[PDB]
């Protein structure tokens, strides 16, 4: 069976905050860079 | 140990193949319909055929084998089924509404008449009545076939049953061999469009109805029913019964009234 | 045309904006008190020490609740429906005008007594003559008679648009394949803009509408001139 | 017209299907199909909550027809009472499965 | 036929620790491996046309 | 609502690392972006 | 309505039974004969290049892209007429 | 282990974490998208190209925040978290299907985003209206890949209905009647009935506007025989039921809410609530042609929409007023849930009245298509749906994860998103009634002013969205775990403690029927 | 000879925003009003008000290609 308890019923680790923080930027910068990159695309076809 | 009657269901990978199996098709459906490639499509047909056999049959399992389908779990997949058949209801709607809208108020590119100039609908007291008739006959068949199982007679389930599935076959081939017949197609306006979309999705409806009374069959050929506990059996046929009343709206709709 | 800094309805040029101007008052009023009702019970509700945590009863303050917000829907209906029949009202045109919406220009036929007509295109900017405004000057405008009940039919030979007037309450979508109708009677002559209001693509933003309402004998030595 | 061979539930169910099926014949109710009717509540008659741990959330609807259900965990030991309207419960647990 | 779901009972109730999309026996387990590979190949497939449609081929 | 004290204190620093990393994970890569539109719609 | 049968003391599976040969079926065999009398290939009609049917606004995904899926060469023309 | 627990899921609170995770990233998808449409309206000119990529942005970011963001969070998420724990369930009705429904989202975000990747995307609009959605006017892929990704959101949600529907009804303890159990759930039960008659319907319009594109159907097309007025029919049949799907939840939500840091045991007036939420969905299914009063229909087809628009304000009046008749005497706790749920109540209000405006066919000839739309549907929208998402994630977090967030900091998230949203919003009245139209990538001269400030208020709420990621990453940081939560007596959802077992109520709660 | 018209007046068979089928009607009903003319021999004059009608109504393109049909024998409407 699986883990329980504060932090434990997550598909992500928080057990070091620093790369909970490069998990968490490289999750929510992905989603906001997206749409930029996807414009830069349609841009540079014509 | 749990002391209520409900199901924990074991950790499953179908709902992870099946919602891939969905992007495979969809992306498939767009790679025909634009990159002449049908690749995509045949393997997105597959895994979700595979899907379906792996999913049902570990309900199955759990209800015939495992005994997990109390009266609770079975009062909820009666629920789940008629829910089920509401919004497939609600989805024909939409097609007798795009019937209604275009036949009641024809536009001048047709001749400002319906059916439009240059169509010439099939006679609806030829095979369409024949459908008619196959349908709702079958409909008799599978209250028998329920009668059956329920007296626990085993011989008379089977053979009720097949005599249904008989029906719904000869359902399908006629519409098969009307489809082909038809001097008119789906690319002939709107009377064309309206026709073979919703005849064409009602089709499809017949066939998985069908498909689901032959597993039906081979479930009873293999002793799985009781004669008191059949939930497959009773959403097969709430399904049948659906195809059917469908059918009817259909015939008076579109074969009848609007010919 | 709006202003700089605008906060309303431009100017109504048409007795049938004047209503609606009114009646846009009427409404904004009720808008503004039930709003600020609001706004005034949540600070009155949360601006007390004391208090009272018990069950309360709510059938008898539900009544009053519904009742009077059924009453207030119903001073706005009113007005609202007379303005909708009025804008309904036969009235006989002494001229049809008929314009299609294409991608990215307007097309306009006065087919009454001559087979007149013309396209209409927006001012490119790079283009514009000292005073014009940008995106919104048309090289051929729609001349016609003021003072007068005018029949506008509206259509599309591609996709949908939209035929709007702001200053003369007009807004008629253009569908292909449909005869869209609408009545437009300016009270005063004048330049009157508008644009093309339903996403239609690339050039959406660039197919204004600009109309140019002059004396009846100016409209007629117009049409003559521009066959 | 008429003939057998198919299972009946008394021959063929399983697993949980069969023990509620069973247990329902001997009029006892193990897997809490049933909603159980209360007694006055009293010090003396209160109402006898079956668990089979040592503590199970009571929900209690303190007047019929009431919206609000008041929820509490109920401790083996000494009978609890509704926060709200006071009615006892005293918890009676183990077993179910022998 | 005969009456078999006895048996089958018997073998889907075996306590393995199996979960029932693989508790049939190896079978189960050859066409869930089949299974999943079509999908995830299907999926990398998908992602490759996307990639190839996303550009222009003038 | 009560809560014991954190197992793992964010002091004031660590507090502006990780705003100050959670602020640029938004702000650079539109930034970038935004800041060659024109190398872009014509190129 | 009522119908004009009887029955009612009690439908079970012998009932269902009795309906399924006596009713049903019998209307089934009925239909097919119908059926299978007013069929007869109809002579098809002079074809007419009417601009609201055989649309073809993007080929189709199969055969040469001008092709109903059903495309029966006897009585369905193609945009230019019928085949030979 | 991992595979089978994130991937294999059969729980219902793992399942509502794995939808609260998609529709957070979907909201940093909607907000870039947001901000491209305030950039290039920031000032006067053009600044990305023609209408044609401004409207690409347009639709996805519509797209994106309603059926990636909104419905995700609110259902699939505080749903499957707490509908199940709220009247004692063991798990939903069918856990695995349950699954299916999350699963079926990331391949409706792919093709949604390949829409946009491939040709010059789908510049329709959210509500792809032929002849610009047809195969000559968006030639290519594009429409057929955002139809697919509307077919998948689909049957997602209509699953999704199917198991809320059946767990409300059929797994609540024996004596607990269904005017027993909390007005979330009964807002859970009412969207899931909405969603489950509303969505065929635009299933089977798309159906016909793939099949005009691909099989040369005429359904939509003039030369056929057919009308472009049909579609929109068939989309706002959908459409109008789409917008209270997207606000229920939420209703739900304000009153737990409300109720709780007013510190009440009960809601003012349960079945008056019940009954308003009943109303609102009824009524929502024969409203829509509200959306075509400038299509040319009938007068008295016009009278008759605009009359029953109106009738609903009766019952969301008497749940506005129930909210406050819930604060009432209350010992309220300032905690920022309470803050975001009264800025939801006020918002809201001003939003729904600005719709009761639009009611009007008369007025609505010249407010339709213009930002006065914008301003309303926004007000709703961005300030009524996101402020209840935001209540209730600051309210729960601590449930769900068992760590407790920093109060101050989410007070100045609330500040700072709460100047954002008015000032983005509430110049685009002016806008309105001015006479702007909607989806346009420039504007004439006269506009400048509001557009410019509108822009400005967009920034806001960006470093709103910004701040917001980091408090939550403060939480997991910290780990200050929560020990004791007050009410729990009228609020069974955090009684199993913070986080909750894996499984909960494997022995069901007791309740006598007395 | 009756007429001195402006623009085709209100008819109370469509009162409607949608006058899509005044313009068709009319068209049909002076082609049809011309061929009675001219073929019992007869003056083409008398089909003058349907004209008037559907030339005030009728988009050019729409008449156009109902010509273009007329001549090419898809015309759908009866004549
Ligand atoms: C897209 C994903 C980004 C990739 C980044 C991951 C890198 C992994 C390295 C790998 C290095 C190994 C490290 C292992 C352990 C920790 C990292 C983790 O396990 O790795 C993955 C885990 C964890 O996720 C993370 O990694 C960090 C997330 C932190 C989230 C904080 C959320 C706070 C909000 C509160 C939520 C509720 C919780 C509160 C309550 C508590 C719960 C009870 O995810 C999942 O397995 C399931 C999530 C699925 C879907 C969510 C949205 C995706 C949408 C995509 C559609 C795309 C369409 C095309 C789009 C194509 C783009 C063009
Ligand atoms: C940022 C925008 C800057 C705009 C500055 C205006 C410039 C004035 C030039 C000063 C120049 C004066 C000369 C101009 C007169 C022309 C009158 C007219 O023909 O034009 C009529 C127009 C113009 O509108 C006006 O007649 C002025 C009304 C202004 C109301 C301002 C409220 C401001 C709140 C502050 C922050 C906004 C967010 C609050 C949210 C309120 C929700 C609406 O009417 C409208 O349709 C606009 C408003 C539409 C819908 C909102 C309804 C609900 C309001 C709720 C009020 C809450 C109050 C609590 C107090 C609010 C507490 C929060
Ligand atoms: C959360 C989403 C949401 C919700 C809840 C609503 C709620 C309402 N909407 Fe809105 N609406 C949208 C989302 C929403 N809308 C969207 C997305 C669009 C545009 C779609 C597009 O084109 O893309 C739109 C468009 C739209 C239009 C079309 C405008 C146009 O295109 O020209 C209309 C027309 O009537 C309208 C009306 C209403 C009304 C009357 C309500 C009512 O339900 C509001 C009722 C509430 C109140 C009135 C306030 C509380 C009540 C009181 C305090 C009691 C006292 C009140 C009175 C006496 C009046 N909406
Ligand atoms: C729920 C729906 C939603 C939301 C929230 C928003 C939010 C915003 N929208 Fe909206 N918008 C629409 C739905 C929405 N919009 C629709 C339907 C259209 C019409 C499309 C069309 O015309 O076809 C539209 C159109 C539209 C236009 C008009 C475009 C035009 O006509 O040309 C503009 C212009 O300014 C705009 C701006 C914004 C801005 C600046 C925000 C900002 O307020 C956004 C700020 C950020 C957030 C509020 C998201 C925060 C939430 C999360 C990130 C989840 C967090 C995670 C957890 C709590 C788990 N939008
Ligand atoms: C191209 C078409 C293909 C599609 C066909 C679709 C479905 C058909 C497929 C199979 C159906 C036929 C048989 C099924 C298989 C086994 C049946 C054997 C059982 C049997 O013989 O049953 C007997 C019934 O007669 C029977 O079949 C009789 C069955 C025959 C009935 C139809 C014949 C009609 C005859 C003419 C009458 C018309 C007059 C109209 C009257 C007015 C009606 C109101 C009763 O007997 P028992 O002693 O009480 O029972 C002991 C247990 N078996
Ligand atoms: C025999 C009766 C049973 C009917 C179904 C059997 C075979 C057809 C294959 C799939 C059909 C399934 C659903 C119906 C979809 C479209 C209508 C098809 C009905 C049909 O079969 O119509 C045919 C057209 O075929 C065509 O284009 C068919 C081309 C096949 C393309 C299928 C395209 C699929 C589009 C799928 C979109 C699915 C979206 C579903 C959403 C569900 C809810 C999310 C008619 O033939 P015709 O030559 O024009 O005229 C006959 C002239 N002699
Ligand atoms: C049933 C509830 C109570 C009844 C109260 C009224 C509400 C719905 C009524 C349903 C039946 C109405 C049919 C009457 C037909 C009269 C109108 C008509 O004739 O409308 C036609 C289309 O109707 C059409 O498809 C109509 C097709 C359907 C549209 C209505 C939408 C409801 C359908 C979904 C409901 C789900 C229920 C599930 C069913 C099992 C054509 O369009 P017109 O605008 O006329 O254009 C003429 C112009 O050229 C001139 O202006
Ligand atoms: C060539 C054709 C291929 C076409 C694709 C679709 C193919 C087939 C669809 C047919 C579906 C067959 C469904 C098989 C279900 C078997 C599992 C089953 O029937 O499971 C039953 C439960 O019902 C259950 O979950 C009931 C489960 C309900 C499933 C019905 C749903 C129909 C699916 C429709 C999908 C398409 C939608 C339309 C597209 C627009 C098991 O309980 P019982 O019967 O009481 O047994 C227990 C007793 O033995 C105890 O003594
Ligand atoms: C190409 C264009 C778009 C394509 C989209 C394709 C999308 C998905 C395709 C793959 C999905 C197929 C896999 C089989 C799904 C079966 C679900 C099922 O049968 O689910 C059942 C519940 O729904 C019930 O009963 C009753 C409900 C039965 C629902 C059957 C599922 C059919 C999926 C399609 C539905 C379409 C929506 C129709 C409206 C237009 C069982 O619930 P579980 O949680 O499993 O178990 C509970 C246990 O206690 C049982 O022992
Ligand atoms: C709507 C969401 C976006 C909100 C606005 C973004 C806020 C500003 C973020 C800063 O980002 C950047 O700033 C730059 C400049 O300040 C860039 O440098 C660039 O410019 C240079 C300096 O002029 C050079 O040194 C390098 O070549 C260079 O690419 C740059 O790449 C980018 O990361
Ligand atoms: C073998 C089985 C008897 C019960 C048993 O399995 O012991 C018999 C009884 C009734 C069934 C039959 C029914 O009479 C209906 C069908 C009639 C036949 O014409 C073909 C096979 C047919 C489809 C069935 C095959 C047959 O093998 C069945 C399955
Ligand atoms: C009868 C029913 C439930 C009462 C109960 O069993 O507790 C109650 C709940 C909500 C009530 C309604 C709401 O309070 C709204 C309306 C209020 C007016 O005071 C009367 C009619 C009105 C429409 C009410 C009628 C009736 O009293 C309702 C429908
Ligand atoms: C809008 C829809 C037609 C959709 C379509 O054209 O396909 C039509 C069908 C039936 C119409 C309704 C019915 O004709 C009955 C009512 C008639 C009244 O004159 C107006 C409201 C009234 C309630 C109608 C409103 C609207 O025009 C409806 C609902
Ligand atoms: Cu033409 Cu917008
Ligand atoms: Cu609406
Ligand atoms: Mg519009
Ligand atoms: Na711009
Ligand atoms: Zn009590």
């Given amino acids: 069976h699986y883990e329980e308890g504060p932090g434990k019923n997550i598909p992500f680790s928080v057990e070091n905050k620093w790369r909970l923080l490069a998990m968490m930027t490289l999750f929510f910068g992905s989603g906001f860079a997206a749409p930029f990159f996807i414009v830069r695309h349609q841009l540079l076809k014509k | 140990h749990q002391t209520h009657a ?61 005994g997990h389908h109390t009266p609770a779990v079975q009062k909820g997949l009666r629920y789940g089924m008629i829910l089920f058949i509401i919004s497939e209801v609600l989805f024909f709607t939409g097609f007798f509404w795009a019937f209604y809208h275009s036949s009641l108020a024809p536009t001048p590119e047709l001749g400002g008449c319906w059916p439009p100039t240059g169509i010439h609908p099939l006679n609806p007291l030829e095979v369409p009545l024949l459908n008619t008739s196959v349908l709702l006959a079958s409909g008799v068949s599978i209250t028998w076939a329920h009668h059956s199982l329920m007296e626990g007679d085993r011989k008379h389930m089977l053979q009720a049953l097949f005599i249904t599935i008989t029906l719904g076959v000869y359902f399908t081939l006629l519409q098969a061999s009307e489809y082909y017949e038809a001097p008119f197609t789906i690319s002939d306006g709107v009377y064309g469009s309206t026709f073979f979309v919703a005849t064409g999705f009602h089709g499809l409806h017949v066939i998985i109805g069908s498909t689901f009374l032959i597993v039906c069959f081979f479930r009873q050929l293999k002793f799985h029913f009781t004669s008191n506990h059949h939930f497959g059996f009773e959403a097969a046929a709430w399904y049948w019964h659906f195809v059917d009343v469908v059918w009817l709206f259909l015939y008076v709709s579109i074969y009848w009234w609007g010919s | ?57 709510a059938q008898e303050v539900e009544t009053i609740w519904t009742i009077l917000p059924a009453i207030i829907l119903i001073l706005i209906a009113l007005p609202s429906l007379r303005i909708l029949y009025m804008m309904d009202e036969i009235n006989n045109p002494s001229l049809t005008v008929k314009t299609m919406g294409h991608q990215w220009y307007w097309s306009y036929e006065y087919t009454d007594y001559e087979d007149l007509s013309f396209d ?81 693509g690339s050039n959406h933003s660039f197919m204004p509408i600009v109309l140019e309402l002059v004396p009846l004998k100016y409209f007629e030595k117009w049409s003559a001139s521009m066959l | 017209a008429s003939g057998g061979g198919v299972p009946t539930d008394e021959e063929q169910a399983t697993g949980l299907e069969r023990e509620v099926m069973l247990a329902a014949r001997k009029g006892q109710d193990p897997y809490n199909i049933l909603a159980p009717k209360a007694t006055s509540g009293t010090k003396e008659d209160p109402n006898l909550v079956p668990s089979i741990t040592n503590k199970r959330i009571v929900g209690c609807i303190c007047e019929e027809d009431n919206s609000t259900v008041i929820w509490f965990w109920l401790h083996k030991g000494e009978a609890q009472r509704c926060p709200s309207c006071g009615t006892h419960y005293k918890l009676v647990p183990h077993q179910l499965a022998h | 036929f005969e009456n078999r779901v006895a048996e089958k009972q018997k073998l889907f109730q075996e306590d393995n620790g199996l979960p029932v999309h693989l508790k049939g026996g190896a079978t189960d387990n050859i066409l869930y491996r089949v299974t999943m590979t079509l999908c995830l190949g299907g999926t990398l497939y998908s992602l490759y046309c996307l990639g190839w449609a996303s550009f222009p081929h003038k | 609502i009560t809560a014991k004290p954190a197992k793992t204190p964010t002091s004031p620093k660590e507090q502006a690392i990780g705003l100050s990393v959670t602020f640029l994970s938004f702000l650079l890569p539109a930034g970038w972006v935004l800041y060659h539109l024109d190398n872009y719609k014509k190129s | 309505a009522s119908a004009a049968k009887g029955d009612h003391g009690g439908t079970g599976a012998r009932t269902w039974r009795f309906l399924t040969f006596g009713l049903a079926l019998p209307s089934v065999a009925l239909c097919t004969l119908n059926s299978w009398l007013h069929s007869g290939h109809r002579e098809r009609p002079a074809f007419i290049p009417y601009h609201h049917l055989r649309i073809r606004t993007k080929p189709f995904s199969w055969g040469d892209g001008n092709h109903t899926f059903f495309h029966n060469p006897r009585v369905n023309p193609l945009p230019t007429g019928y085949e030979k | ?102 699963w079926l989202l990331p391949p409706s975000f792919l093709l949604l985003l390949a829409s946009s990747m491939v040709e010059a995307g789908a510049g329709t609009g959210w509500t792809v209206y032929p002849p610009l959605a047809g195969n000559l006017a968006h030639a290519g892929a594009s429409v057929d890949l955002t139809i697919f990704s509307l077919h998948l959101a689909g049957v997602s949600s209509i699953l999704g ?39 065929p319907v635009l299933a089977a319009g798309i159906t016909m506007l793939l099949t005009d594109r691909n099989l040369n159907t005429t359904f939509f097309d003039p030369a056929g025989g057919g009308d472009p007025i049909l579609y929109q029919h068939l989309f706002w049949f959908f459409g109008h039921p789409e917008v209270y799907i ?99 109540i006020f918002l809201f209000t001003v939003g729904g009245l600005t719709g009761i405006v639009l009611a009007n066919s008369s007025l609505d000839i010249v407010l339709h298509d213009t930002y006065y739309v914008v301003a309303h549907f926004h007000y709703v929208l961005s300030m009524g749906a996101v402020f209840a998402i935001m209540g209730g994630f600051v309210h729960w977090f601590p449930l769900f994860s068992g760590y407790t967030l920093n109060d101050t900091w989410a007070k100045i998230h609330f500040a700072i998103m709460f100047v954002g949203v008015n000032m983005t919003f509430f110049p685009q009245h002016f806008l309105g009634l001015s006479g702007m139209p909607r989806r346009y990538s420039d504007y004439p001269d006269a506009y400048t002013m509001w557009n410019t400030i509108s822009s400005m208020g967009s920034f806001i709420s960006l470093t709103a969205v910004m701040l917001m990621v980091f408090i939550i990453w403060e939480a997991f940081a910290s780990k200050r775990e929560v020990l004791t939560v007050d009410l729990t007596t009228t609020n069974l959802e955090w009684l199993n403690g913070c986080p909750p077992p894996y499984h909960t109520f494997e022995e069901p709660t007791y309740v006598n029927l007395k | 000879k009756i007429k001195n018209y402006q623009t085709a007046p209100f008819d109370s068979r469509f009162p409607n925003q949608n006058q899509t089928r005044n313009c068709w009607q009319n068209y049909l009903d002076f082609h049809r009003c011309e061929k009675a003319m001219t073929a019992k021999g007869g003056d083409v004059s008398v089909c003058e008000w349907y004209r008037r009608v559907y030339k005030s109504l009728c988009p050019i393109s729409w008449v156009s290609t109902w010509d273009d049909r007329r001549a090419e024998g898809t015309f759908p409407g009866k004549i």
């Fill in chain 2, 6 to 66: 409900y199901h924990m269901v074991n950790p499953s990978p179908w709902p992870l193949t099946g919602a891939l199996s969905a992007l495979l098709m969809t992306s498939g459906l767009t790679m025909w319909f634009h990159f002449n490639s049908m690749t995509l499509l045949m393997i997105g047909l597959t895994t979700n055929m595979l899907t379906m056999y792996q999913w049902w049959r570990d309900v199955i399992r759990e209800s015939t084998f495992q």
């Fill in chain 3, 1 to 57: 045309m709006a202003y700089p800094m605008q906060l309303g309805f431009q100017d109504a040029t048409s007795p049938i904006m004047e209503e609606l101007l009114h009646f846009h008052d009427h409404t904004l009023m009720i808008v503004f008190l039930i709003s600020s009702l609001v706004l005034y019970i949540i600070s009155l509700m949360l601006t007390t020490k004391l208090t009272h945590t018990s069950t309360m009863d």
């Fill in chain 3, 120 to 200: 209409s295109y927006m001012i490119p900017t790079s283009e514009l003559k000292p005073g014009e405004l940008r995106l919104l000057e048309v090289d051929n405008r729609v001349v016609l008679p003021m003072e007068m009940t005018i029949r506008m039919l509206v259509s599309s030979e591609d996709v949908l648009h939209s035929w709007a007037v702001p200053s003369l309450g007009l807004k008629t979508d253009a569908i292909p394949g449909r005869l869209n109708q609408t009545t437009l009677m300016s009270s005063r002559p004048g330049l009157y803009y508008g644009q093309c209001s339903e996403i239609c």
């Fill in chain 8, 1 to 102: 282990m991992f595979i089978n627990r994130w991937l294999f899921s059969t729980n219902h609170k793992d399942i509502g974490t794995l939808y609260l995770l998609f529709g957070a990233w979907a909201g940093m998808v909607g907000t870039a998208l947001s901000l491209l449409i305030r950039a290039e309206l920031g000032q006067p000119g053009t600044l990305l190209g023609d209408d044609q990529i401004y409207n690409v942005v347009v639709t996805a970011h519509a797209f994106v925040m309603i059926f990636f963001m909104v419905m995700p969070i609110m259902i699939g998420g505080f749903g499957n978290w707490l509908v199940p724990l709220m009247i004692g369930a063991p798990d939903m009705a069918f856990p695995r299907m349950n699954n299916m429904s999350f």
């Fill in chain 8, 161 to 199: 209905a199917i198991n809320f529907i059946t767990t409300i009804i059929n797994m609540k303890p024996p004596a607990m009647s269904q005017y027993q159990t909390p007005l979330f759930v009964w807002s859970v039960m009412i969207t899931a009935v909405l969603l489950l008659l509303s969505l």
């Fill in chain 8, 246 to 344: 997207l606000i229920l939840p939420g209703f739900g939500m304000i009153s737990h809410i409300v109720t709780y840091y007013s510190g009440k045991k009960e809601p003012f007036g349960y079945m008056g609530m019940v009954w308003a939420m009943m109303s609102i969905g009824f009524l929502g299914f024969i409203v829509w042609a509200h959306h075509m009063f400038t299509v040319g229909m009938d007068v008295d087809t016009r009278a008759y929409f605009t009359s029953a628009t109106m009738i609903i304000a009766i019952p969301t009046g008497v749940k506005v007023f129930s909210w406050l008749a819930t604060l009432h005497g209350g010992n309220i706790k300032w905690s920022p849930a309470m803050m975001w749920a009264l800025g939801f």
